[PDB]
Write a protein that binds this ligand. Structure first.
Ligand SMILES: Nc1ccn([C@@H]2O[C@H](COP(=O)(O)OP(=O)(O)OP(=O)(O)O)[C@@H](O)[C@H]2O)c(=O)n1
Length: 376
């Protein structure tokens, strides 16, 4: 609610210094759609060090690509010099970046017409490629020659799919046919960028339409384990967490986490998936189930099997929540047994823990001692 104002102030300051400056990218597209922008990018004739001269606080991490982050009025505004970029078939080499001297040299190499507009300080729209009419017709269309845009960055092919669902647009026919012809190029894209786009699709609207384009575009032929995305997505409803899309995909096909490990999940994400899948294969959940698994795993497993229980209340009403509340530890068992420390302690602590979680044995050291001396 303050980002557009701050971007306008940034533009005013750049122009006071004699430079050209415009709002570009998604913010123009969102403004024309009546949405509040997420991010507001500025394109300028200023070079990075000239931007830094004009603003007190700046972050420089993107300077090599022409970008300076300007910190103003509590917002961040990316300011990028007019530039073009090209990606090599080797995704180890940083992008080849070529500063250019005019706005339209920059705009004419962006991915889609609705993303290739600029807005002046006085709200005039610069639209050489017909983004306004594609926006009104709800069409995702590559700028210029679609083959060139997709050779410049193959991830754009998957971005088209993601935008279709995010905006409830269709993909321009000539553009879609170009994706089909170039879909093999997706193999050169870093898997982290692929996962980022797929995660967006999984939580965005009209995801079933996105997944149909994923197949129709022949991206599922060449994406890492891409055939696994061709499941029935009818009964998928996002919980806001993209991990649920991966879980859904795996559960629908009776597959395990190892089949999707090419996408380089965090250990935390991997655990949520694997533990949720275990729960879906567990025929009966009882107190020990609710104790040992996390509420988010219980909820995700329930969501994908179609159950609707009040999982939080069941877990909350166990006698204890976790091991740290147990009234006994291995050194109590060493004392009572007269035996030396060894792996046996873990076995006997778990026996006791189970009896406490089932509400059979009281979580009380002296009463546990009585039980242990009788049982051991
Ligand atoms: N692979 C890409 C990514 C970006 N763009 C250009 O860079 C702009 C900003 O990119 P991004 O930060 O990804 O913003 P959006 O296009 O709006 O994507 P999102 O809606 O997720 O923010 C895009 O609008 C487009 O003009 C591009 O041409 N090729």
């Amino acid at each position: 609610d303050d980002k557009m104002n701050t971007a306008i102030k940034v533009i005013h300051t750049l122009k006071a210094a004699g430079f050209e400056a415009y709002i570009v990218g998604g913010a123009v597209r969102d403004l024309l759609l009546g949405k509040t922008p997420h991010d507001v990018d500025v394109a300028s004739s200023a070079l990075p060090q000239q931007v830094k001269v004009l603003f007190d606080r700046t972050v420089d991490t993107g300077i090599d690509h022409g970008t300076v982050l300007v910190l103003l009025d509590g917002e961040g505004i990316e300011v990028t010099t007019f530039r073009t970029e090209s990606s090599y078939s080797d995704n180890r080499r940083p992008d080849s970046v070529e500063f250019v001297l005019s706005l339209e040299e920059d705009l004419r190499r962006r991915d889609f017409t609705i993303n290739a507009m600029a807005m002046t300080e006085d709200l005039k729209i610069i639209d050489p490629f017909g983004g306004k009419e594609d926006l009104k017709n709800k069409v995702i269309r590559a700028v210029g020659d679609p083959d060139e845009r997709f050779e410049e960055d193959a991830l754009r092919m998957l971005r088209a799919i993601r935008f279709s669902g995010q905006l409830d647009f269709i993909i321009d026919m000539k553009t879609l046919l170009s994706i089909r012809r170039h879909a093999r190029l997706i193999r050169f894209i870093a898997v982290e960028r692929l996962k980022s786009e797929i995660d967006k699709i999984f939580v965005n609207p009209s995801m079933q339409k996105s997944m149909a384009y994923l197949k129709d575009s022949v991206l599922t032929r060449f994406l890492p384990v891409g055939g696994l995305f061709e499941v029935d997505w009818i009964t998928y409803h996002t919980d806001g967490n993209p991990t649920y899309g991966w879980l859904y995909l795996l559960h629908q096909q009776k597959r395990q986490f190892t089949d999707i490990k090419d996408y380089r999940f965090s250990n935390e994400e991997k655990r949520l998936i694997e533990k949720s899948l275990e729960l879906t294969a567990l025929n009966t959940w009882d107190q020990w189930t609710f104790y040992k698994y996390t509420l988010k795993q219980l909820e995700m497993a329930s969501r994908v099997t179609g159950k609707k229980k009040d999982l939080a209340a069941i877990k909350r009403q166990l006698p204890i929540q976790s091991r740290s509340e147990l009234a006994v530890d291995g050194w109590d068992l060493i004392e009572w047994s007269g035996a030396k420390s060894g792996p046996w302690l873990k076995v006997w602590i778990e026996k006791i823990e189970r009896l406490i979680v089932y509400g059979i044995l009281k979580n009380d050291k002296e009463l546990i001692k009585d039980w242990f001396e009788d049982e051991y």
